[PDB]
């Protein structure tokens, strides 16, 4: 039953066994019923760590491969290893994207969950864009941007500027502009507006989520500081 798999996912998280956590949460999602906020967060944490391990390995192996320019045997070994890690990463992203298309997005009957999932779709296309072949990149970048843009419109209409999901979407979409589209001014503008609109309506913070909101606001401003410096 669903509740047992969720409890198993919480145990796996504590044990730092993210593949087990992800398998539990994917089994829960596959039952087809709309996820609770808690279940949604567990699925997200599991996959973030599963793909995260590959993103980090990819950065390390990519850096080595560049440093070994003019070192034939070493460079080739690093290229092939990078390609192996890339394959794993793409499979993970595609698995999440498939859950999003088959279950999560169509069953989302609430604005908050629609935004969360569309943001997640933007993130996972963004992770695919980080490793995309020059030829596939455009399409992948477009899919990420459209998912974030749709999430953005809904959050702007339905949520207060201090809502953590609205703030987290602005944070990740601003990073998408900066790192993926190489548009630092649209990145800064997006992050500044999100921060400023939250400060201007800080009385809308709730005692339940004010620390979640203010943490994301700190990240927005820190990125803004980095990017305007």
């Amino acid at each position: 039953d669903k509740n047992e798999l969720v409890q198993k996912a919480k145990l796996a998280e504590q044990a730092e066994r993210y593949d087990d956590m992800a398998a539990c949460m994917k089994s829960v999602t596959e039952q087809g019923a709309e996820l609770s906020n808690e279940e949604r967060n567990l699925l997200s944490v599991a996959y973030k760590n599963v793909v995260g391990a590959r993103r980090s390995s990819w950065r390390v192996v990519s850096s080595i491969e560049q440093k070994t320019e003019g070192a034939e045997k070493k460079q080739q070994m690093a290229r092939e290893y990078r390609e192996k890690i890339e394959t794993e990463l793409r499979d993970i992203c595609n698995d999440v994207l498939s859950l999003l298309e088959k279950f999560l997005i169509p069953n989302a009957s609430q604005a908050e969950s629609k935004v969360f999932y569309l943001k997640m779709k933007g993130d996972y296309y963004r992770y695919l864009a980080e490793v995309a072949a020059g030829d596939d990149k455009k399409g992948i970048v477009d899919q990420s941007q459209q998912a974030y843009q749709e999430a953005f419109e809904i959050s702007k209409k339905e949520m207060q500027p201090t809502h953590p999901i609205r703030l987290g979407l602005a944070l990740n979409f601003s990073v998408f502009y900066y790192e993926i589209l190489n548009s630092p001014e649209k990145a800064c503008s997006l992050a500044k507006t999100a921060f400023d609109e939250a400060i201007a309506e800080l009385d809308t913070l709730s005692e339940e989520s004010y620390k979640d909101s203010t943490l994301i606001m700190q990240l927005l401003r820190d990125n803004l500081t980095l990017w305007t410096s």
Partner: peptide, 8 residues
């Protein structure tokens, strides 16, 4: 190693 952050 990336200076700017996304969620988490």
């Amino acid at each position: 190693k990336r200076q700017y952050k996304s969620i988490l």
